[PDB]
Amino acid sequence: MRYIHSEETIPVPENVKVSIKSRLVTVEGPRGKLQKDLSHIAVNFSVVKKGVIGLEIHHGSRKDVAALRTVRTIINNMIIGVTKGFKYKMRYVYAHFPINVNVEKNAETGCYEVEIRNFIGEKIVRKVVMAPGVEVEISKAQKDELILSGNSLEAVSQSAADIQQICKVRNKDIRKFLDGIYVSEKGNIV
Template sequence: MKYVQSVESVAIPEGVTVSIKSRVVKVTGPRGELVKALKHVDVAFEKVNNKLIKLYVHNGDRKHVATLRTVKSLITNLIKGVTVGYKYKMKFVYAHFPINVNVIEKEGSKLIEIRNFLGDKKVREVPIPTGVTCELGQKDELIVTGNSVEDVSQTCADVQQICRVRNKDIRKFLDGIYVSERGHIVEEL
């Protein structure tokens, strides 16, 4: 079944400016600027005023209309990123061998260095993308912060994936580094 016209709208809060040019969304706010290219998505944008953006799909089927909600979520994530930011906390879980984690700079790029995972001699390194900061919290905690939810969550996913237990029963060996808390840098009231 074809839908004649489907519409979603995104509200823009105070202090945030959104500019859309040829399906490249640029959001500027108090915490910085984020750019997202949506050229691959067949959605029409209309900036009604400085407080509202409308998204349209004309004559779309069910899956085409579903992309409308996805685009709306992507834009609201950009707006939330430049206003309050994203903060993920990761906990180190180990039974016997303590996991050592450091944030290092190597050849001009920052890395998360993981040592002694399950007693391995192998040093695991995860690159930190630009715009993301990682710091060690209190005991056995890594705090990953940034404006882009995609970059922050992908960094956490890379850390968790590199510390997977292989060739052992994962019900018994629960060692690893896992996301324990998701939140915002600027706490909302």
């Protein structure tokens, strides 16, 4: 079955500017500006109402209709990123060797870098380079905690996943060795 018309709607707050040109969405708000190329999905954008974006597919199959939900959630996440931001709080715990985490800003690349030392007594220094736009802060309120803040949910969550996956225990019982860095809390900055 091919459905003749299928539509989704996105409400837009007052402080958001959305510019779509050849399926390239540019969302700018108080915190910053994000861009995303959605040209790989056949979709027609329109202004159905004031502050309302309309997404429509004509003569599409069920897969083509279902793709609009992904596009809707992507644009909504961009709007939430430029309005409230995204914040991932991570906690690093240890049993015997205290894990040392250093955060600096590589200014030549314009991006933050995290150096992890003494992970279960290893002499190697693990290094994680952040995606641009993600800011790393060692939390002063709680103990042994990083905070990743940004406008791009994909960038912040991918940086968090990189920090988890660079600290993995190998050739040991994971029931006994609980060392590592884990994402404790996910939420919005504001």
